[PDB]
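Changelog entry

Holo records now carry the ligand SMILES as an explicit input line rather than a separate metadata file. Below, a converted record for magnesium ion, shown in the new format.
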Amino acid sequence: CRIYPKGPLLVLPEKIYLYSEPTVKELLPFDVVINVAEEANDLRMQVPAVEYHHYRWEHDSQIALDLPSLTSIIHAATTKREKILIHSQCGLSRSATLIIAYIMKYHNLSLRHSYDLLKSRADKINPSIGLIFQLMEWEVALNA
Ligand SMILES: [Mg+2]
Ligand SMILES: [Mg+2]
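Structure line, unchanged by the conversion:
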């Protein structure tokens, strides 16, 4: 591919977190955990006090499809003021994409401004082009 040397970085005031691949124990404080990396171990059974979601994204997935469901999981957690972790393998591309996507809908911002917001708090984010295009699709629907 430590990147996040102090653990899961709070990126949004609504207790939205961003990380690379976790260990089991690192998952514990979170109410909702969304794992958007195919190769990243499914830790579901290992943590019963956690609403665990795994979406097996690879860098060439049609992620725009998954975005209504995924951003709804997130919005529903924020109204209940729950602690939320969104992680991938390296916490650069797939997980950042999902957050940016959230920001587009529920912060009512453009792709560009949403990216700018996350890069401002997660300096190392580097969304893949394929994923950027999937986000471009997301921007269209939200504008329809
Ligand atoms: Mg692993
Ligand atoms: Mg493939």
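Spot-checked after migration. The two ends are 37 Å apart (CA to CA). Residues 96 and 125 are 7 Å apart (CA to CA).
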